[PDB]
Design a binder for these strands. Structure first.
Lengths: 101, 84, 215, 154, 60, 128, 118
RNA sequence: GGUACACGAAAAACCUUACCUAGACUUGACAUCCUUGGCAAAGUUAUGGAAACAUAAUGCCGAGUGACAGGUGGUGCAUGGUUGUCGUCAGCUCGUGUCGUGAGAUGUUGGGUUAAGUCCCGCAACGAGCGCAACCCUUAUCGUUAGUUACAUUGUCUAGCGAGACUGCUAAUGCAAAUUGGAGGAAGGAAGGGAUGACGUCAAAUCAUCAUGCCCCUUAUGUCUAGGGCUGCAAACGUGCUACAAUGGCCAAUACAAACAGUCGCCAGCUUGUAAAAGUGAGCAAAUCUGUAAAGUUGGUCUCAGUUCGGAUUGAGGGCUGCAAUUCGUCCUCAUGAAGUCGGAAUCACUAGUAAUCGCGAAUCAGCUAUGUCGCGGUGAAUACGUUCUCG
């Protein structure tokens, strides 16, 4: 037991990369750390932007682009340090970030 | 006067107005930045205020002591309402 | 009028050339302005190695650089000098204390990235090789590596004011609309004594299918 | 060269269990929202039944049946004058025109709450008080004047 | 006259009252948003290539 | 006894509960007043009509919670949820359930707005 | 005020267009001295109307506010300043366009010949 | 004109600002090299000044030398890149070879059949490629997954996967494409949408995304600071944006949030200013803390009216960030109640969530008379004979 409750938020800008990171971490922390829930997700905050195309004229001439986001959550009542010890051997792809809230 | 200040310290125009008042009120100086809001004691002066070409000796009107010198200076010259 | 479905192809059907996540909306601009200089310097400084692409990750002023090249031997060089020069240059360009780790990996049919293709085509155009034969050289460069169908265009100036004389190559299955197509499009702005010339290449990494999601 | 495209409508309203009431609610729908229009039409039917003491549904359907239109026009010119070809219009447009005329003539009074005047106009159109019945009569009469222009092909 | 804007980026704006957002390569001072720090034309053209992390052609 | 279905309409989700009873129909959602929480609509009485072509409306007390949308949004959501819970009772009445657009979710959401189109399809006018 | 004893409708409407009292202040006056916005009243008892006029004059007096507004316009116009020059041209001073906006100040559809010089 | 009208520019008291005036900067405001070092370039309040700038003190390191340094100034017929017109069209290009005496044709066309060169069939034809569909996301029913701060009358909820729907089957009917009916499925006929613009096309526009050959100025198209103008204005057109009103105005009880938005932003909550907001004070880097969802419901009034529509314009009092709110920022409290009571040609969006309507959030930001614009959400119509006038 290390932390009474660790809130790990997985924030990414793709569904596939976030799912890959979630599965990787949930499979590597098991066996060195116990009492961790599965892939618990969070509602996302994907946004859409629209940027003009023509240099000067026709403001209506724009292309639309997506700023996607996808989030998972883990609430670790029981935490072991070794959970992160192996995290550097299966190092997370940079498309996903882990926030310790 | 920012519609929120009746008596506020400008901290960079009070010196000039005080020095001018220290004779009787000697008006003409060379100060024309629109960062200088007038307040109590800023009652009567002429500044070489800028229009865009020249610094005419614009009188800071005593009718209102909050509206700044930029208002008092005519810094526009339109077509003089022509039909063209 | 002239668009390639590559922005949607890169990112939801493929990856980015510079991908990184962040929690703030302010350092993103600084990171995106900073990493482009490193990418451009690595591209221009190393063309004998034909550096296919560079991946940049930036998190909290922490910059990591990965390099994929068509001829990685020139990146290391003889007696392993160029590798040391590259390592020190990249370590210094990202910051005095910024961490850096690099690995050397190759890609199947190495000359399949449109970047080096366009760069070498421009070099051939301005390297005593006539325009038709430079076109053929670029076509061989993409083809002899092991790549699929080729689209090559050279627009701009012929040292004149006419716009109704040029040549262009299309060979094979290049759907401009298929999202899952694995197409690389690159452009080079070459400075000639009469203006700037745009050399554009669309090269198929392979007619990909059943792989429409990010990896 | 658009071909035939089907028309669409919505489900009836329980005040009458008919589609005409709901379509009137759709047409008179202000704020783009049908709750206010539904309330307006419910009060309209209440004021219809409390005036002249006659059942609202038969009154409303008689109004929409006597406002009933039977024509649409295809314009065409010869050299400097344009005349008309009367064409059979689908019944969807016929009932739509009837209901739209009812709705538009319902609110053309400025004296009180809209409830009394919409009720009065529905009553008038049912009792053939000329607000839109004259349009049907004129269409029927000019159906003996535009078929002459329909006959010759210029 | 790009050096005016360049040095104005380098020279300290005496207060936040000098509101302008620019890029180190882009000369325009309009729509160079703080999220990416680059011109709208630059951004859209490089987004046809899909290089910015989490930027793809929008489809809801 | 306690059934629990799902229902959606116009970015509105519903969690429904039905139980075979002998009440009058129990027309209420979120367990509050239908006078003001339910605005003037046609669903305010058409909620328990799908109970008529199924397990009698005297059964299946309406115990529903809502999430999101507008006064007709969660209304359609809860109606679909109640009929989904009805499906759990007698699927062999579905011959008159799917036909009335009850088991069917309309697959309909408000059309996404576009640049230049401040509404959904409306655009600037061209008067001289 | 003190003129125009109400008729044909309630009192919240009568005072909306008399200097110093508008819709909001008419509603406040109605809520203050028990004016009773009932089913329909045209003229209340004449024991409260004296107090009604007294509290309406408590709000800036119509004759007084007419002079106040006129003198404020004159003083903002008599000065030699930008606001004065915008005043004397019958054009908006809050900051507005006078090319096609600023209407009822530039007249309703006062279309003129817009001469173009190349 | 289509193919510039809330364009670039997604916000002007200094900049944004690209112009002008003034003061300043001078191998230079930017800079390099060059010599060479090690504690200062930075920085502060004065002070003349508007600060520029000279200024004194100060806290891994920076500087003089001359080559030269910076260019948004255009030349878009010099262009790259960029999009748009037709048009996301209904077709297009290319090779083999054949047919012509050459231009050229062929296929690629035509009958069936589609949004499509969709395919079949036939034909000197054979195929290769491009555009619409195609992966992609977005969308709905079910099953299922992990489990809080969800649900809890629980694996619902969220986000993850799969099944499922592909005229699929049956009957017509066509050698084929592909149409119709029933039912299954939630969703059936390219299951809703789009992504990408075929050949060109306007040497359209872009020298200014960045530039760019050319010229154009460099102790001066370079640069700092101060200010003003882009919101001037006899005015017009375009768009939104308030209206010309009882679905509307006022009063009173009164629901559902969302792409979701949020770190110095959302700010819970408390108090007060009838008001802009102030004082107090968490939490929220967000499933957590907010961000109210509103219109709509319920009843009463105004009971018809330049009008309980419209605060246009205008001003009195404060409010906001902001050094400072004046030209070139703004909000309410309050007041004038103009014009306009549906508008001449000329018109617009439209095939169900469409027109129509109402709220919310956001980049811009110091600020906003951005009302824009973007995005979301809610509620919720008609019509569509057919291209006949029609244009594409």
């Amino acid at each position: 037991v290390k932390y009474p409750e660790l809130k790990i938020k997985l924030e990414s800008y793709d569904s596939t990369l976030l799912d890959l990171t979630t599965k990787k971490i949930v499979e590597v922390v098991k066996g060195v750390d116990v009492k961790i829930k599965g892939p618990l997700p969070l509602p996302t905050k994907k946004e859409v932007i629209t940027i003009i195309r023509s240099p000067h004229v026709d403001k209506a001439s724009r292309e639309q682009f997506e700023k996607n986001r996808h989030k998972r959550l883990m609430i670790l009542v029981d935490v072991n340090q070794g959970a992160i010890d192996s995290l550097k051997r299966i190092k997370i792809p940079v498309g996903v970030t882990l926030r310790f809230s | 006067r920012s519609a929120k200040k009746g008596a506020f310290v400008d901290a960079h125009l009070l010196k000039k107005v005080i020095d001018m008042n220290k004779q009787e009120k000697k008006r003409p100086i060379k100060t024309w930045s629109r960062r200088s809001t007038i307040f109590p004691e800023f009652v009567g002066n002429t500044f070489a205020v800028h229009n865009g070409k020249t610094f005419i000796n614009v009188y800071v009107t005593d009718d209102m002591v909050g509206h700044k010198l930029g208002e008092f200076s005519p810094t526009r010259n339109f077509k003089q309402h022509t039909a063209n | 009028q002239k668009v390639n479905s590559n922005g949607l192809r890169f990112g939801i059907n493929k990856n980015w050339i510079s991908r990184w996540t962040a929690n703030s909306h302010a350092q993103t601009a600084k990171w995106l302005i900073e990493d482009e200089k490193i990418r451009n310097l690595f591209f221009v400084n190393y063309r004998n190695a034909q550096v296919s692409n560079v991946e940049i990750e930036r998190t909290q002023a922490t910059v990591d650089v990965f390099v994929y090249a068509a001829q990685p031997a020139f990146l290391i060089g003889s007696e392993n000098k160029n590798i040391q020069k590259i390592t020190k240059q990249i370590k210094q360009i990202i910051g005095r204390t910024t961490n850096l780790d690099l690995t050397i990996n190759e890609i199947g049919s190495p000359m399949l990235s449109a970047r080096i293709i366009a760069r070498d085509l421009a070099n051939a155009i301005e390297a005593r090789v006539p325009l038709r034969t430079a076109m053929r050289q670029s076509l061989i460069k993409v083809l002899k590596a092991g790549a699929n169908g080729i689209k090559v265009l050279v627009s701009g100036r012929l040292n004149g004011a006419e716009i109704a004389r040029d040549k262009m190559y299309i060979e094979g299955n290049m759907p401009l609309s298929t999202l899952r197509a694995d197409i690389d499009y690159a452009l080079e702005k070459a400075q000639t004594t009469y203006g700037v010339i745009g050399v554009k290449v669309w090269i198929n990494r392979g007619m990909i299918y059943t792989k429409g999601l990010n990896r | 060269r658009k071909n035939r495209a089907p028309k669409r409508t919505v489900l009836p309203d329980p005040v009458f269990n008919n589609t005409l009431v709901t379509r009137i609610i759709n047409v008179i729908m202000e704020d783009g929202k049908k709750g206010l229009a539904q309330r307006i039409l419910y009060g309209a039917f209440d004021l219809i039944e409390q005036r002249t003491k006659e059942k609202p549904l038969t009154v409303f359907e008689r109004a929409v049946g006597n406002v009933m239109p039977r024509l649409e026009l295809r314009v065409r010119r010869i050299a400097g004058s344009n005349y008309q070809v009367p064409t059979e219009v689908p019944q969807d447009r016929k009932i739509a025109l009837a209901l739209r005329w009812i709705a538009m003539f319902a609110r053309k009074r400025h004296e009180k709450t809209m409830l009394e005047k919409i009720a009065n106009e529905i009553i008038d159109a049912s009792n053939n008080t000329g607000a839109a019945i004259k349009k049907k009569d004129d269409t029927h009469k000019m159906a003996e004047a535009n078929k002459a222009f329909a006959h010759m092909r210029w | 006259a790009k050096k005016s804007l360049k040095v104005k980026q380098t020279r300290i704006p005496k207060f936040a009252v000098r509101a302008y957002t620019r890029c180190q390569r882009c000369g325009r001072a309009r729509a160079v948003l703080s999220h990416f720090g680059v011109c709208r034309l630059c951004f859209r053209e490089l987004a046809y290539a899909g290089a910015i992390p989490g930027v793809k052609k929008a489809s809801w | 006894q306690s059934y629990y279905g799902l229902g959606r309409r116009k970015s509105s989700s519903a969690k429904v509960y039905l139980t075979p009873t002998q009440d009058k129909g129990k027309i209420t959602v979120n367990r509050r007043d239908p006078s003001e929480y339910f605005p003037n609509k046609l669903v305010i009485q058409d909620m328990e009509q799908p109970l008529d072509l199924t397990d009698l409306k005297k059964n299946f007390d309406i115990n529903v919670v809502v999430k999101g949308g507008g006064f007709t949004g969660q209304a359609g959501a809860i109606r679909l949820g109640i009929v989904r819970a009805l499906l759990q009772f007698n699927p062999e009445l579905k011959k008159i359930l799917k036909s009335k657009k009850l088991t069917t979710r309309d697959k309909r959401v408000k059309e996404r707005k576009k640049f230049g189109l401040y509404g959904a399809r409306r655009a600037p006018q061209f008067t001289k | 005020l003190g003129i125009d004893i109400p008729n044909q409708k309630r009192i919240e409407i009568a005072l909306t267009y008399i200097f110093g009292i508008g819709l909001s202040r008419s509603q406040a006056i109605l809520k203050q001295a028990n004016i009773n916005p009932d089913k329909r009243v045209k003229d209340l008892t004449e024991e409260e109307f004296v107090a009604i006029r007294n509290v309406a004059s408590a709000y800036k007096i119509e004759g007084d506010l007419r002079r106040e507004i006129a003198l404020n316009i004159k003083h903002l116009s008599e000065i030699g300043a930008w606001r004065g020059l915008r005043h004397r041209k019958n054009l908006p001073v809050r900051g507005q366009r006078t090319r096609t906006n600023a209407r009822t100040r530039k007249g309703p559809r006062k279309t003129v010949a817009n001469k173009k010089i190349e």
